[PDB]
C-alpha cells in the first residue's frame, strides 16, 4: 500500500515532463527545411 | 497482471535508439546539413 | 534499504502505469512537436526563421549596440 | 644450482629492493640510455633543423632556453621516417644538427615503457597478485606511443612527433588542433571525460574515505596515525560513506561494494585514455574531428555561423602561421 | 512542538530524494539553471548578440548549441528580466542573451546549495565534511571562470558560453590571447587533473589486483560484505609491489585517500588563481629574455617563439568573427600567414 | 530572406540577356557541384591552380568572359586556358571527353546548364567564394 | 553446462567464459560467429554494389570490399574501370547464402547438439591440456590456410590474374607467369628494416613478389600443418608455455594484434596490393602529386623548376634527399621514398630526371596527379574531405584512412586483450587468479625490502 504521490514522484515529473516535451519538439525540428 | 520488466526495457531501448537515430538523420537532412 | 516509496520496477511493470503513460508520454511528445511545427517557438523565443536572418534592408549581422533601448534596435533590425 | 639457474633466480628474485625480472633486463638499459641522452641533450644539445629547411631550433638550456621553453627537438623532416642512429651520421655534429638525440631517446623510451608494462605483470606474477595493473598502465603507454610513434608514422615523419619539452608539447597540441580539430573529435572528448571524471572520482573516493575514518587518534595528532601498516581492520566505515553518498544523490547511485567501486575507479580513466590514445592514433591517418563549417544555411543559402565556425577561424589562424617557411604548395597534405 | 522543528522534521525526512534546508536553495536554483540551459540550447538564438546560430531550432547539433554570453554592449549588467534592457519583455530578454546570466547566477546559487547539502547530510549522517571541502575546487573554478574572468574583462560577452563548442572557443581564445598554456597556474592545474586521473586509475587497479581470495567464484565482486570488518585487499602486497616497481609506495591508507582528494582539488584551486590573473590580462604571455634576443638575433628560434607566432595568427584570423561588435575590418593583406599556406 | 527570383537571375549571354534558374534547377546545380566539382572547386577556389578560381572577378576576366551561363556551358563542353589559347579538353573535366572523364558522361545539357547557373549564383551567397586557398 | 553465476562462478558479463570446457557449445559459438563474419562480407558487399556508381572511382563511394575484389581481378579492366558489376554481386551472394548454413550449424551446436564432444568423438573431442590433439587442430587449420594462399596463387596465375597497377601501358589485370621463387628476395623482404626507405614487408612492390610469397606461404603452412599433426610439443615449449584454453586465446590475441597493426600500415603505405585506382592515393602519393602538379603548372608558366630556389634556400620544386637522390621539394621531402606507377616514368638513375620532367610529361600523368592531390587521405569524422579547416561541400574520406584507422584501433584493443588473457591465464594456472589467500599470502613470508 505505497503512496502514489510523494516527493520522489514530483522529482521524477519535474524532469520527465519537459524532457519528453523537448524531445518531441526536437523531433519536429528534424523535418524543418530551410 | 504484470508486464515483464525485460519487455519494458526492450521497448524503452528501441524507442531511445529510435529518437537517437532520428536525431542523426536530421544531421543529414533539413536544417544544419550544409545542403 | 527502502525509504517508503514504491519501487520503480513495481511501478513500470504495472498495468495502470502504462494505461496512463500510453497516453501521457505521447501527448507530451506531440505537444512539443506542435510547439515547433506550428511556428509557435519562433514567436515565443524570437529565434529567426530560416528566411528572417537577413532582410531586404540588412545584409549584415544584427549585433546589438545600444546599452538600454534594445526593443528599438531589434525592431529596426527587423 | 647451475650458474645460469643462479642468475635466473637472482633476476626473478622478489627480495631485490627494485625488482628486475626479464622485462627489467631490457627496461633498465633502455630507460637508462634514454635518460642519459635526454638530460645531456636537454642541457647541451645544439640547435636542430626540425623542419628540414635549414632553420635550426634551439632546444637546450645552454643555447638560450629556460626550463619551460627547453626541449629535445624531433629529428629533421628531411629524415622523415628513416632510421637515424649515431653510426649513420658522418659526425656527431651532423647527428646533432639533424635531431638524432630525439630518435635515440624516443626509441629507447618506447622500448623501456613497454618493458615497464611487462615488468608490472611479471612482479604481480611473482607476488601471487592478480595480473591486470599492467592493463591499466597500458593506457598511458598507448597515449605515449600515439604521440611519439603512431602519429609520426601516419604523418610520415618523426619531425611530427611530440617534442620532448613543455613548450614543445604546446606547439604539438596547437598544430594538432589546427590540422585535426581534436577538440571536436569524440575520442578526445572521451579522454577529457576520462581525466575530468578520474579527478572527480579520485576527489570523491578520497573525500568519502577521509570523511568516514574510524576514530583512532586524539585531536593533537594527524588522523593518518590512526592507520597502522598491515592492520587487519578497515580504517573507515564504508557503510557510513554509502549512507552519506546515497543521500547526497539517491541510494541506488552509491556503491556499497568496495570491489565494484575500486573497479569503476580503475576502469573509467583507463578507458577514457584508451579512447584518446586511439583518437590521436587515428588522426595520425588524418581521420579528423567533426567538421561543421557552414553546416547551417538560411533559405537563400547564406551561411549562418555557429561556434564551430569561430573555432574554425581560430584553427585557420593557427594553420596559416605554423611552420611559416616550410610550405611551398597551397595544401598542407602532411 | 514548534513550527520550525516540525518543518525541520519534514525537510530532513528519509525519502528517495533528501531535501533538507539546503534543498530550498539547491533545487529551485539547479532546476532554473538546467532548464534555462536546455531551453536556450533548444530554442534560443545568439543572432543578435554574437551573429551565430546557437540552438537546435536553428539547426545546430549537441556539439554546436549553446547558451551564449550576452552582447558586449551590456557590459556587466546583470540582465534581469525586469531590468532596464529587457524591461519585462521575455522575447527580447531571450534575444539579448539574458539566459546566460540566468543560467550562471542560478547555477552559482545551485552550487552553493549543493555544498550546503553536502554539509547538511554530512552532519546528519555523522561523518566529517571532507566531501564538501573537496567540492570547493569546482566552485573555485566556476566562480573564477564564469564570474571573475568576465567581471575583469569588458563584459559578460567574453565569459565562456554554456556549450560544447562555446567552451572550445573559450579555450582557444585563452590560448591565442592569453597564452594560457604558458601560465604556471594552469600547469599546476593540469598536473592536478592528470595526477587525479592517474591516482584514480592506479588505486582502482591496485585494489582490484591485490584482492584477498574471499570467495569460490571467478566473479570476485561477490566476495565483499559492506559490514565486514576485514580489509578486502592486501595493503602489504600492494605496498611491496609498488615499492619494487616504482621505488616507493603508499604504506598509510589514510594518507593515500587524503592524497586522492588533495591532488585534483589543489589543481583546480591553482588553475582558478591563474584564471583570476587572466581576468585582468595579467598573463604569463611572454619570456622577455627570449623576445629581446629574437628581436636582436634573427637566427634564434625556440618552441616558445613558435607558439608566440601561432598566437598572433589565431588572434588576427579570429578577432573579426569572434568579436563582431567591434567591427574589426582586417583586410586580407594585413593577415599574418606563413609562405604558401 | 528566401532564395528570391533576383538571386537566381543571372546573365545568360554577354549581349545583356538574363535567365532565372528555378529552385529545382538551383538545387540540381548545387548537387552536381557537390558531387563533381568540389574536389577541386570547394567554395569557389581551385586547389590545383588557384590563379584561375571560380570567383566573380576571375570568371569575368577570362577570354571570352565566363560570368554568363552560356560561356560556362561552353567551357564545360570545350575547356580552354584563361586566354582562350590552349586546348584543355584532356586536362579539365568536360562532357566532350567521356573516355577520360567517365564521371561526367551522364550529365546532360540541362545538368551542365544547372551547374553553370549554380556556379554563377554561389558567389552571391558567400563573400569568401573564390578567395585564397586558406581564408 | 551451468548458465548462471551460482553454478559457474562467472557473471552474465563474463558468460562466454562458461563455455571454456564445453567443447560442443563452444564449437557452436565459433561456427555461428564465423557465420556472422561471412554474413557481413556478403551483406556489406551487396550494400556496396547497390550503392556503387560504376563510372565514379571506387575510393569516392565509401567502398572497402569491392576494392578487394577488384584487386583480385574481377569486374574491372584497364586502369581499374568497371567492366561488369556481376562478379562483385556473385561474391556477395555466395557469402550471404553460406552465412545461413554456418548460422544454422552454430545455433545447432550451441543449442541442440552435444555440449561436450569428448564422449562423442576422439577426433573432435579435445582437452585443452592434450597437447597432441591441440597441435592436430593447429595442423589441420595450417593446411587449409596454406590451401587458401595457394588459392590466391591459382587465381593470379591460372584463373584470370590479378590487378597489376605497375603493368606496362597502364594498370590492368595481369596473369602472373614468373612469380618470385627466389628465397633470397622473398625472405629478404622479411629482413628489411621497418623504417623509411625500406619498409619491411610493406614495401613489396610487384605482383611477382606477392605471388611468389604466397607459394612459399602455402608451402610453409602446409609443411607446418603436417609437422604439427605428426609431432607433439617438445620439452622446452612444454616448459616455457601455458597450456590452457585461455592461454591459447591470449596467444591468438597477440598474433591478431600484430596482424592488425601490420594491415593498418600495409593499407596506409603500400599501393601494390592496395592499388590507388581502387583505394585512392596514399598520403605519400597525394603529397608527391601536389608537388608534381605545381611543378608542371609553374614549368608551363615558364619557370625554371631546377634552378628556382625557394624562400628558405632549398629548391622550391626539386631538392636532394639526405643521400643525394633528386626529389620533390617542400614538406613532401619526407615522402621521397614514395614509388608510384605515374611517377616512376619520370625518375632516372639519380632520382627525378630533368630531361624527363621537361619533355616527357603526359596529360594522363597531370590528370592523375591532380586527382590524387585532391583526394588526399585527409577528412573529417563526418566525411568532409580535404583539410580540416575547409568548408562543408566535399563528401570524401579515403578508404585507406578508414581501413588504417579501424585496424590500428582493433590491433591495439587486441593487444590489450592479449595482456588481459595472458595475465589471467598465467594467474589461473598458478592458482591465484581469484585473489590472495589470507593464510598463505606470499609477501607475509618474504623479507622486508629494507
Ligand atoms: C566566494 C564564492 C561564493 C559563491 C559566489 C556566488 C554569488 C554570486 C553573486 C554575486 C554576483 C556579483 C555580480 C557583480 C556585477 C558587477 O560587478 O558589475 C560591474 C559593475 C561595474 O560596472 C562596470 O563599470 C565599468 C567602469 O565604469 C565606469 O567607467 C567607465 C569608463 O570610464 C564609464 O565612465 C562609466 O560611466 C563608469 O561608471 C564599465 O562601465 C563596465 O562596462 C561596467 O559594467 O560593478 C558593480 O556592479 C559592483 C562593483 C563593486 C562590487 C564588487 C563585487 C564583485 C567583484 C568583482 C571583481 C571585479 C574585478 C575582479 C576580477 C578578477
Ligand atoms: C614484435 C617486435 C617489436 C619490437 C621489434 C622492433 C620494433 C619495431 C616497431 C615498429 C617501428 C616502426 C618505426 C618506423 C615506422 C615506419 O618507418 O613506417 C611504417 C613501416 C612501413 O615503412 C614504410 O614503408 C613504405 C613502403 O612503401 C614503398 O613501397 C610501396 C609498394 O607499393 C609503395 O610503392 C610506396 O610508395 C613505397 O614508398 C616506405 O618505404 C616508407 O618510407 C616506410 O616508412 O612499418 C613497417 O615497416 C612494419 C610495420 C610495423 C608496425 C608498427 C606500427 C605499430 C606499432 C605497434 C603499436 C603499439 C601500440 C600499442 C600501445 C600500448
Ligand atoms: C558472437 C556472439 C555470441 C555467440 C555466438 C554466443 C554463443 C553462446 N553464448 Mg554468449 N554472449 C554474448 C555473445 C555471444 N554468445 C554476449 C555479447 C554476451 C553478453 C550479453 C553473452 C553472454 C552469455 C551468457 C551469460 C551465457 C552465454 C552462453 C552462450 C552459449 C549458449 C547459448 C544459449 O544457450 O543461449 C540460449 C539463448 C536463446 C535460446 C535465445 C535465442 C538465441 C538464438 C541463437 C537466436 C538466433 C537468431 C538468428 C537470427 C536465427 C537465424 C536462423 C537461421 C537464419 C540460421 C552459446 C554457445 C551461455 C553459456 O555459456 O552456456 C553454458 C551463458 O550462460 N552467453
Ligand atoms: C573494419 C571495419 C570497417 C571499416 C573500415 C568500415 C568503413 C566504412 N564503412 Mg562500414 N561497416 C562495418 C565495418 C567497417 N566499415 C560494419 C561492421 C558494419 C555493420 C554495421 C558496417 C556498415 C556500414 C554501412 C551501413 C555503411 C558503412 C559505410 C562505411 C564508410 C563510411 C564510414 C563512416 O562514415 O563511419 C562513421 C564512423 C563511425 C560511426 C565511428 C564508429 C566508432 C566505433 C563504434 C568505435 C568503436 C571503437 C572500439 C572498438 C570500442 C571498443 C570499446 C572497448 C574495447 C573499450 C567507410 C568506408 C557507409 C558507406 O559509405 O557505405 C558505402 C555506410 O553507409 N558501413
Ligand atoms: C568448424 C565447423 C564444424 C565442426 C568442427 C563440426 C563438427 C561436428 N559436427 Mg557440425 N556443423 C557445422 C560445422 C561444424 N561441425 C555446420 C556449419 C553445420 C551446418 C550444416 C553443422 C551441422 C551439424 C549437424 C546437423 C550435426 C553435426 C555433427 C557434428 C559432429 C560429427 C560430424 C560428422 O558427421 O563427422 C564428419 C563429417 C564429415 C567428414 C562430412 C562433413 C564434412 C563437410 C560437410 C564437407 C566439407 C566442409 C566444407 C563444405 C568444405 C570446406 C568449408 C569451407 C568454409 C572452406 C562433429 C562434432 C553431428 C553431431 O553432433 O553428431 C553427434 C550432427 O548431428 N554438425
Ligand atoms: C598458426 C601457426 C602456428 C602455431 C600456433 C604453432 C605453434 C607451435 N609450434 Mg609451429 N610451425 C608453424 C605454425 C605454427 N606453429 C609452421 C607454419 C611451421 C613450419 C615452419 C612450424 C614449425 C614448427 C617447428 C619446427 C616447431 C614448432 C613448434 C611449435 C610450438 C612452440 C613454438 C613456440 O614456442 O613459438 C614461439 C617461438 C619461439 C619461442 C622462438 C623464439 C623466436 C624469437 C622470440 C624471435 C621472435 C620474432 C619476433 C618476436 C616477432 C617479429 C614479428 C614478425 C617476425 C612477424 C607451438 C605448439 C615447436 C614444437 O614444439 O614442435 C612440435 C618446434 O620445434 N613449429
Ligand atoms: C577473439 C577474441 C576474444 C575472445 C574469444 C574472448 C573471450 C573471452 N573474454 Mg576477452 N577480450 C578480447 C578478446 C577476446 N575475448 C579483447 C580484444 C579484449 C580487450 C578489450 C578483451 C577483454 C576482456 C575482459 C576485460 C574480460 C574478457 C573475458 C572474456 C571471457 C568472457 C567474455 C564474455 O562473456 O563477454 C561478454 C560480452 C560482453 C559483455 C559484450 C561487450 C560489449 C562491448 C563493450 C562492446 C564493444 C564495442 C563494440 C564493437 C560495439 C560498438 C558499437 C556501439 C556504437 C554500440 C571469454 C573467454 C572476461 C574474462 O576474463 O573471463 C574469463 C573478462 O573479464 N575479455
Ligand atoms: C535496436 C533499436 C532499433 C533500431 C532501429 C531504429 C533505430 C534508429 C533508426 C532510424 C534512422 C532513420 C533512417 C533514415 C530514414 C531513411 C532515409 C534515408 O534513406 O536516409 C536519409 C539520408 C539521405 O540518404 C538518401 O536519402 C534519399 C532521400 O530520402 C534516399 O532515401 C536515398 O536512398 C538515401 O541514401 O541519409 C541519412 O541520413 C543516413 C544517415 C542516418 C541514418 C541512420 C542513423 C543512425 C541509426 C541509429 C544509430 C544511432 C543510435 C544510437 C544508439 C546507441 C546504440 C547503438
Ligand atoms: C528558462 C526560463 C525559465 C525556466 C524554464 C525551465 C525550467 C525549462 C525547463 C526545461 C526542461 C527541463 C527541459 C528538458 C529537456 C531535456 C531534453 C532535451 C532531453 C534530451 C534527452 C536525450 C536526447 C538523451 C538521449 C539519450 C542519450 C544520449 C543516452 C541514453 C539514450 C538516450 C536516447 C535517452 C522560466 C520560465 C523560469 C523563465 C524564463 C526563462
Ligand atoms: C606472402 C607474402 C610475402 C611473404 C611473407 C613471408 C615469407 C612470411 C613469413 C613470416 C614468418 C616467418 C613469420 C614469423 C613470425 C614470428 C613470430 C611472430 C614469433 C614469435 C615468437 C614468440 C611469440 C616467442 C615467445 C616467447 C619468447 C619471447 C621467449 C620465451 C618465452 C616465449 C615462448 C613466450 C612477401 C613479404 C614476400 C610478399 C608479400 C606476400
Ligand atoms: C627447431 C627444432 C627444435 C627441436 C628441439 C627439441 C628436439 C626434439 C627432441 O625431443 C625433445 O628433446 C628435448 C631436448 O631439448 C626434450 O626436452 C624433450 O623431452 C623432447 O620432446
Ligand atoms: O612538420 Mn610539423 O606540422 Ca605535420 O601538417 Mn604538413 O607537416 Mn609540417 O605542415 Mn602542418
Ligand atoms: Ca570526383
Ligand atoms: Cl609551428
Ligand atoms: Cl610544401
From Swiss-Prot, chain A:
The lineage of its organism: Bacteria, Bacillati, Cyanobacteriota, Cyanophyceae, Synechococcales. Its cofactor is heme b. One of its GO terms (biological process) is photosynthetic electron transport chain. Heme binds at residues 8, 13. It is a single-pass membrane protein. This is Cytochrome b559 subunit beta. This b-type cytochrome is tightly associated with the reaction center of photosystem II (PSII). PSII is a light-driven water:plastoquinone oxidoreductase that uses light energy to abstract electrons from H(2)O, generating O(2) and a proton gradient subsequently used for ATP formation. It consists of a core antenna complex that captures photons, and an electron transfer chain that converts photonic excitation into a charge separation. Belongs to the PsbE/PsbF family. GO terms for cellular component: photosystem II reaction center; plasma membrane-derived thylakoid membrane; plasma membrane-derived thylakoid photosystem II. Keywords: Electron transport, Heme, Iron, Membrane, Metal-binding, Photosynthesis, Photosystem II, Thylakoid, Transmembrane, Transmembrane helix, Transport. It comes from Synechocystis sp. (strain ATCC 27184 / PCC 6803 / Kazusa). The keyword Membrane applies. With its partner (PsbE) binds heme. PSII binds additional chlorophylls, carotenoids and specific lipids. Its main location: membrane. It comes from the Bacteria. The chain crosses the membrane at residues 7-31.
Swiss-Prot record, chain B:
This is Photosystem II reaction center protein J. It holds the Pfam family PsbJ. Gene3D superfamilies: 6.10.250.2070. The chain crosses the membrane at residues 5-27. It is a single-pass membrane protein. The gene is psbJ. It comes from Synechocystis sp. (strain ATCC 27184 / PCC 6803 / Kazusa). One of its GO terms (biological process) is photosynthesis. It is found in: Cellular thylakoid membrane.
UniProtKB/Swiss-Prot annotation, chain C:
Its cofactor is heme b. The chain crosses the membrane at residues 17-38. It is a single-pass membrane protein. GO terms for cellular component: photosystem II reaction center; plasma membrane-derived thylakoid membrane; plasma membrane-derived thylakoid photosystem II. Changing residue 21 to L: Complete loss of PSII activity, decreased accumulation of PSII subunits, altered mobility of the PsbE subunit. The keyword Thylakoid applies. One of its GO terms (molecular function) is electron transfer activity. GO terms for biological process: photosynthetic electron transport chain. Keywords: Electron transport, Heme, Iron, Membrane, Metal-binding, Photosynthesis, Photosystem II, Thylakoid, Transmembrane, Transmembrane helix, Transport. It comes from Synechocystis sp. (strain ATCC 27184 / PCC 6803 / Kazusa). Heterodimer of an alpha subunit and a beta subunit. PSII is composed of 1 copy each of membrane proteins PsbA, PsbB, PsbC, PsbD, PsbE, PsbF, PsbH, PsbI, PsbJ, PsbK, PsbL, PsbM, PsbT, PsbX, PsbY, PsbZ, Psb30/Ycf12, peripheral proteins PsbO, CyanoQ (PsbQ), PsbU, PsbV and a large number of cofactors. It forms dimeric complexes. The keyword Electron transport applies. Belongs to the PsbE/PsbF family. This is Cytochrome b559 subunit alpha. NCBIfam families: cyt_b559_alpha (TIGR01332). Its main location: membrane. InterPro entries: PSII_cyt_b559_asu, PSII_cyt_b559_asu_sf, PSII_cyt_b559_CS, PSII_cyt_b559_N, PSII_cytb559_asu_lum. It is found in: Cellular thylakoid membrane. With its partner (PsbF) binds heme. PSII binds additional chlorophylls, carotenoids and specific lipids. Pfam families: Cytochrom_B559, Cytochrom_B559a. It comes from the Bacteria. Heme binds at residues 16, 21.
Swiss-Prot record, chain E:
Pfam families: Photo_RC. PSII is composed of 1 copy each of membrane proteins PsbA, PsbB, PsbC, PsbD, PsbE, PsbF, PsbH, PsbI, PsbJ, PsbK, PsbL, PsbM, PsbT, PsbX, PsbY, PsbZ, Psb30/Ycf12, peripheral proteins PsbO, CyanoQ (PsbQ), PsbU, PsbV and a large number of cofactors. It forms dimeric complexes. PANTHER family: PHOTOSYSTEM II D2 PROTEIN, PHOTOSYSTEM II PROTEIN D1. Its EC number is 1.10.3.9. Disulfide bonds: none annotated. This is Photosystem II D2 protein. It is found in: Cellular thylakoid membrane. The chain crosses the membrane at residues 21-42, 98-120, 130-151, 180-206, 255-277. PROSITE patterns: REACTION_CENTER (PS00244). The D1/D2 heterodimer binds P680, chlorophylls that are the primary electron donor of PSII, and subsequent electron acceptors. It shares a non-heme iron and each subunit binds pheophytin, quinone, additional chlorophylls, carotenoids and lipids. There is also a Cl(-1) ion associated with D1 and D2, which is required for oxygen evolution. The PSII complex binds additional chlorophylls, carotenoids and specific lipids. It is a multi-pass membrane protein. Chlorophyll a ChlzD2 binds at residue 106. It comes from Synechocystis sp. (strain ATCC 27184 / PCC 6803 / Kazusa). The keyword Iron applies. It catalyses: 2 a plastoquinone + 4 hnu + 2 H2O = 2 a plastoquinol + O2. GO terms for cellular component: photosystem II; plasma membrane-derived thylakoid membrane; plasma membrane-derived thylakoid photosystem II. One of its GO terms (biological process) is photosynthetic electron transport in photosystem II. Chlorophyll a PD2 binds at residue 186. Belongs to the reaction center PufL/M/PsbA/D family.
